[model samples]
Target: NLAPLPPHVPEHLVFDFDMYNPSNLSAGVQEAWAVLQESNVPDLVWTRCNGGHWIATRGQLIREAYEDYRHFSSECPFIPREAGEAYDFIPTSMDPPEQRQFRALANQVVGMPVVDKLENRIQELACSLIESLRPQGQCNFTEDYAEPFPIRIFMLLAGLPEEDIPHLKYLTDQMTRPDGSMTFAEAKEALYDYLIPIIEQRRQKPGTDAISIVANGQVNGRPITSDEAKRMCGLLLVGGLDTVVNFLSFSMEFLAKSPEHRQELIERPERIPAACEELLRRFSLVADGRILTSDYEFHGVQLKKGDQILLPQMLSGLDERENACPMHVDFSRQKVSHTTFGHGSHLCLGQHLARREIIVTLKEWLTRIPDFSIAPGAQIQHKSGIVSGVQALPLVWDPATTKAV
Candidate 1:
């Protein structure tokens, strides 16, 4: 039974933006949201698909709502209230005072110092993966590099086995793209169940690994309990698994289609970082939004209290008002602005690691298969939801063009 839209909203503007459909989505996840940005649609509108909600089409509103946590509660960040309410994943789900504690512990593991420590390993894994596929000349970019690279690295960080990836990845995918086989609550329970034993093991005998460190370390000057540790670790796993995996595939698919863009990066390797920023801005992957706490007027629309809003973190940068030629990717653009990693207190915690992985992949992949594109007859399709991604990216390249490195 779906929740009805707030009475103030007109029926015409209510369109259900289902994230699970796999048809004609090759344009990418955010592209679906871009449909609402078309000239025919207004700047702000209401969607009634999954329990009616409002979607902010511009960056200003999105950023404003993110910062003003007072009016827009972050406790239930996702669209459907139940899913968001049930989503008690440590720091992400908790508000300010309580959120800060777990965030600090998370930072200790995936933060700058931890990232610096793991930098070599990250680079090595990326290069090794690319090298293995260089000779093949034709490969499924999604499975070959995008998914494996980050998931493997994350598993290593959590001190979990690579063997567990199949099961873990399956469950994570379900959360993003539900098959109706399990409820979000059921999925959350199963994930916690798996983490409980691991949390206990790490708590009993702490190690240098991230899981053990967080499970046994102190948060707010007190020992982080097994439950808190599990939740935090769960968020990290979801962040590392879902975000970067999809991002890498999208980045590569974009590069594959745009030879000019690829060559520009090849000519000026220093531009890779800037290009990555632009990519993140242009392809803000996540489609999450916040719940409106009370009746309010935003951008001329009257939203009532308890009204749910789908403030797609992916939409804002696409607004031509904030970004000139919003859809066009300008690697040279002086300021690449967008909430690709979210904003305010809920901004992505593992963003640094994600950026490093993308930058490294672009630099390394271009060094070898600098001239590559989607297979001539193949098609690329995208999937959407709380998390979104390309289903498959069949790529082809000239073996002769490959450089010896």
Candidate 2:
């Protein structure tokens, strides 16, 4: 039941790449995707996997597509067509003019000013969690620290319970990285079901939390509808729960393997912020795409009206043309330029908060447990999807090697 190649694409231009589980994915997810940028691969190639779609292989074309939202519409951002068609999250799902109207409301809650206020809570929780894990010698980095750190802070912000994370997390994961237990539409419906009652309850009695703020908030000089609030809330939950939660593991896994990288951050604590940007570049994890609006010739390729092209935000950072020695981690590089967050009108609004969470973890964790390595003989696995992630990260170190800070 495989989808055949599109008629417009020639035989040689076809590269059978699957975003869910790429072919060259042994070294890591990033390495697996790097295959698309190899010398032999064309700038714009057709992949017959996950139904036929165009794959933009370079930063140049990606930037172009992202910038030209009219041609490369966000109407169908996800692959397999059905899921993208079913995607109905607000702000993210809406394009400019329409999308811009809601960004102001979203920022009032998650913007830099909000981050400035949350700085104390962000730092305090990081120290408390890392200190708790310090004496354990070895810990399940993903469960013990990674999951709890950003998530607990998220729960506090959303005014939701820590108990709700398990259920909500499953529903959210299905929407992005479905395990075939349920279709994307079904998972999305489940999430909506959970949000409906909460949205209804919040409207009666508002609070200072994000959910309440948006529930009773306004837009374009009018009161927001319950359904509109739920749509916006759904996008916020996904960004808060999924984005940084998985990202921390990737950064920590690399630090465990590279003692030299750890030493650099440990020696000069001031460089931790810079290190965060470098890590974001080296381990960038999002790769959603846009669908073509009309039959158009783009960078020498004829894309059909309904073609779905995956313009990976991750690939730009790994592009050699964009960054010399793209794979090498360079903390002190003169300029670290890549659309890891995104580009054009749909750029990520949660990036500032995401950066704060990352910087705090590196500074606080390194201050306490200065050295650690991957558990012996353990092979880390990564799961690829709209937003990719590390399957598990088992890190170990001596109790004596750690100290209380």
Candidate 3:
């Protein structure tokens, strides 16, 4: 579905790469995108995918674009153009000083201190879920543990009902990896609809939950409006349900296929933290973009005002220019760098919490089920969009190898 090249875009620089369903996806989702960083492709090129936009293929260009928000504004941060215009999540959708205030409140909910306070609960849940699944011998890791562990913890923090997960997750998924069943606007409205009443109720009767805190919180010495609260809360739910949920599956799938990597963590428990960073760099999976605010020349290419450029956070660490062996996973890598969470003003507010969950899962799962692999003959499928994800991860192991602890 290649859009006609605009007059401003030179034909020589055209590289039509689709973000949602990449052409070389059979190799792997990340691998497919890595094709952009090849010697043949330019650092920045205009793609005809998702209604046509620019893609920054190298880490240098990607980081430069993210750091310069004026030329590349976050006002429209998604592809297909329509979805970005409709995407009005708090802080993320806002730029700079205006965005910074909301970030303070958001950090209060999922920041480092919050993760420390939630540490015991995170550990207990990881252990509880791993132990329960131990005797089963096989599981669809995506559905069984990956989804529940991070998502349920988020639900508890948000004070949302456990039974509501399927519904909430579905809505959140539609926003990122849409199935075309609902338009971005429709899915966004549905999320706002879900958050409206809960936010209203929480505002009237404030509680310690994340939603309640956001519902009644202040921004720049002013009370957050109901609309603002719902937008912020909706962003929280999307962040909670989607980001870490998909990432965990990818990390586990890698571990299931690589015994040596798993053995590394199992042999030296302390290395899990470093392994987590390396894994994050290798399997990094988030891609969003910004719209050009004015006609400008970026990296020697002419970009028209209002043009969209997808500065994929997923591609940064994968670029061979950024890491010596970008595709290889090595826990001992001295400096693991990537915009997996995000970059610049929108650096992820929940990174600390995400790291905790990942570390806990690696430590706890290895402690019990030390050896596991992909279910025989099972083929894993990955879905790519605003955030990439594993369709399902069918992992199998002998129950006898599992320990109760």
Candidate 4:
């Protein structure tokens, strides 16, 4: 009942990276993959761990796979047979013609217009959250600031109640990094069950909220189905709830550890935007891939039909061929190249929003707590799966150094 790797693949190129285990992760994921690069693995390798799939070890190959949808399909984007089978999020899980329709509607909510309207609100939230924690001199960055700041902003945009965050965020975490309690299908169904009623309510009387607009929006010049609405809404929720939240923690933790990098930002706040881009390129955390639909030959390897190819969206920037000194954080690196927000037609629609939030965080946090680090003797741990994140980031600072905003 288990599928095996294609015969053409060499045994040495295959690696089973246990994505669920917390201990196996690295300070920088792409850096960890560099270990594989050192092992002489090709730019593209096959992994038999999650039901057999191909992993692109270099950004060039990753970009190729993403751009060539004809050969690589996002219809079944996740690994684990069950997840790929039941995964049905629109735009993300759809290809071309069908995907374009939903993508257009999605752009309405998280696209440039939304970013422009929410700019002041996002800046205010970042400043308010950091200020509240600055005087404490010691705080868990992940819980106290990272999670709430984005979750609250997302909830406000979606018109969802803040009180439901705990429940919704818990479910989203399970879906991305399952703890084995529920199958991917079960987790997805749970999400749908939660959103179905909301979709129905919005359908009856649409409002100005993002969810309401999406719930009743049209696609391909026709009304979007409720099921499709639910799928799209779920995608936004996951992107908003996890991506920016986890990425902020990673960037903050990096800044806290590397005073030189912090000084670069503090000395020239203008560089924060470039710093954000470089950080995103270096610390790309989203681990996703696609399934190969038919038998094909790639790089002299015969990939049998129905075999899966995992692009581990996380691996793009790890390639030394693309990035100079790929491991180090270089804020001034010219031509910073990465697919951290993804590439091709499926490129992250909400990336602009994510950038705004990160830039605001770096600017506001540094203005308040310019010098902070992990609390003495505190260990920072990272967890991985679809989205990788810091489990805990305990930070400490001198209370006297912080002034009331």
The candidate that wins on TM-score is 3
Ten residues in sequence with the least summed lDDT for candidate 1 = 15-24
Candidate 2, residue 3: how far the Cα is off, in Å? 0.8
Q: Candidate 4's residue-wise lDDT over 1-405, tens digit each?
A: 234756777787776655555223654544555555665677666666657777777777788888888778888888876788788998899888668888889999999899999988898988888888888899898999889988888998999999998888887888788877888888788888999999999899989999899998999789999988999999999888988989988888888899899888889999999999999988888877777768777766677666667676676676678787888899999988888988888989999898888888888898999988888997777777888888889999997876667
Judged by whole-model lDDT over C-alpha atoms, candidate 3 comes out at 0.92
Which candidate leads the pack in lDDT?
Answer: 3
lDDT of 1 by residue, 111-187 (tens): 87888888999999998998888888899998999999999989888899999888888777767777778767777
Quantify all predictions' global Cα lDDT against the true fold: 0.82, 0.88, 0.92, 0.82
**Per-residue lDDT of 300-394 in model 3, one digit per residue for the tens?**
99999999999999999998777889999999998888888888888999999999999999999999999999999988888889999899899
Number of the candidate with higher TM-score, 2 or 4: 2
Stronger candidate by lDDT (2 vs 4):
2
Candidate 2 collision pairs: none
TM-score of each: 0.95, 0.98, 0.99, 0.96
Candidate 4 residue 193 Cα shift, in angstroms, is 0.6
The C-alpha local distance difference test score for the whole of candidate 4 amounts to 0.82
Q: Clash totals for all models, in order? A: 3, 0, 0, 1
